[PDB]
Amino acid sequence: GYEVHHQKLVFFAEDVGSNKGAIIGLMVGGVVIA
Amino acid sequence: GYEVHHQKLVFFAEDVGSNKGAIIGLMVGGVVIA
Amino acid sequence: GYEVHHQKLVFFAEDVGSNKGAIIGLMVGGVVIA
Amino acid sequence: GYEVHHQKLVFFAEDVGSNKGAIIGLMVGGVVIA
Amino acid sequence: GYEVHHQKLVFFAEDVGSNKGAIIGLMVGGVVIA
Amino acid sequence: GYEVHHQKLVFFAEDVGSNKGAIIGLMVGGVVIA
């Protein structure tokens, strides 16, 4: 008998203001210029 | 007997204001210019 | 009998203001120029 | 002056024979039973 | 002047035979039973 | 003047035979039972 629950995973937990660049959460491969 | 529940996954949990760039949550391959 | 719960994983837990570069949370492979 | 080219991303690069289960390349959310 | 090229990312580079379980390349969130 | 090239990233570089469990390459969050 197992029980798994209430795990929680966040990437950005607050405000993201006045951005002008490249804000990525998860990136597999690929290039980014900024 | 197993029980899995209430897992939770967020990428952006708050406001995203006045953006001017590239805000991506998950990116597989691909280029980004900003 | 096992019980796993309430684990929590964050990448950015506060404000992200006036960005002008490359803010990435998790990056597998891939190049970044900034 | 920038130049980005010839990036390449593969998920399965060879034969996939006699399968009987769940072969997924990329999975966001969702359950799999096998 | 920059130049980025010929990056390469693979997940499975050979044969996948007689499978009976859950073969996933990339999985964000979500449960797997096997 | 920069030059970046020929990077290479593999997860499984050979045969995967007679599987009966959960073979994952990259897993963000999420549970696995096997």
Residue B3 carries which side chain, given as an amino acid letter?
A: E
Q: Which helix (H) or strand (E) is D15 found in, with range?
A: none
Total Cβ atoms within 10 A of residue D14? 15
Cα dihedral E22, D30, B2, E21, rounded to 10, equals -10
Burial (Cβ within 10 Å: 0-12, 13-18, ≥19) of residue B6: exposed
Q: Strand D4-5 vs strand A32-33: parallel, antiparallel, or unpaired? A: unpaired
Q: Is D5 annotated as a binding residue?
A: yes
Q: Is the dihedral of CA C12, A9, B20, B30 positive or negative?
A: positive
| C-alpha distance from F20 to closest chain C C-alpha (Å) | 24
Q: Which residue of B has its CA nearest to E8?
A: B29
Q: What are D10's two structure tokens?
A: 């593969």
Q: How far apart are CA B10 and CA B13, in angstroms?
A: 6
Q: Strand E22-28 vs strand D22-28: parallel, antiparallel, or unpaired? A: parallel
Q: How many residues make up chain F in this entry?
A: 34
Q: Is B2 annotated as a binding residue?
A: yes
List CB contacts (< 8 A) between E7 and chain C: 29-31
Method: cryo-EM
Residue D31's alpha-carbon distances to A29, B4, F15, in angstroms, are 25, 11, 26
Buried b (16+ CB within 10 A) or exposed e, E1-34: eeebbebbbbbbebbbbebbbbbbbbbbbbbbbb
What are the φ and ψ backbone dihedral angles of F15, each rounded to 5 degrees?
-65, 150
Q: Do A13 and C18 touch (CB under 8 A)?
A: no
- Of D7, D23, B23, the residue nearest A26 (C-alpha): B23
Chains contacting A (3+ CB pairs below 8 angstroms): B, C, D, E, F
Q: How far apart are CA E4 and CA E11, in angstroms?
A: 21
Q: Is A4 annotated as a binding residue?
A: no
Total Cβ atoms within 10 A of residue B15? 11
What are the φ and ψ backbone dihedral angles of C18, each rounded to 5 degrees?
55, 30
Burial (Cβ within 10 Å: 0-12, 13-18, ≥19) of residue D33: exposed
CB F34 within 8 A of CB A2: no
Total Cβ atoms within 10 A of residue B34? 20
DSSP B33: E
The label of the residue with tokens 């994983």 reads C9
Residue B31 carries which side chain, given as an amino acid letter?
A: V
The label of the residue with tokens 């998860």 reads A26
Q: In what order do the strands lie in the sheet with E8-9?
A: D8-9, E8-9, F8-9
Cα A33 → chain centroid: 18
Burial (Cβ within 10 Å: 0-12, 13-18, ≥19) of residue F28: buried
| C-alpha distance from F22 to closest chain C C-alpha (Å) | 20
| C-alpha distance from A33 to closest chain D C-alpha (Å) | 9
Chains contacting E (3+ CB pairs below 8 angstroms): A, B, C, D, F
Q: How far apart are CA A31 and CA E5, in angstroms?
A: 10
Beta bridge mates, B26: A26
Q: How far apart are CA B31 and CA A32, in angstroms?
A: 6
Total Cβ atoms within 10 A of residue D21? 20
Resolution to one decimal, Å: 3.3
DSSP D12: B
Q: Which helix (H) or strand (E) is C17 found in, with range?
A: strand C16-17
For chain E, the three-class secondary structure string (H helix, E strand, C coil) is CCCEECCEECCECCCEECCCCEEEEEEECCCEEC
Q: What are E28's two structure tokens?
A: 């964000």
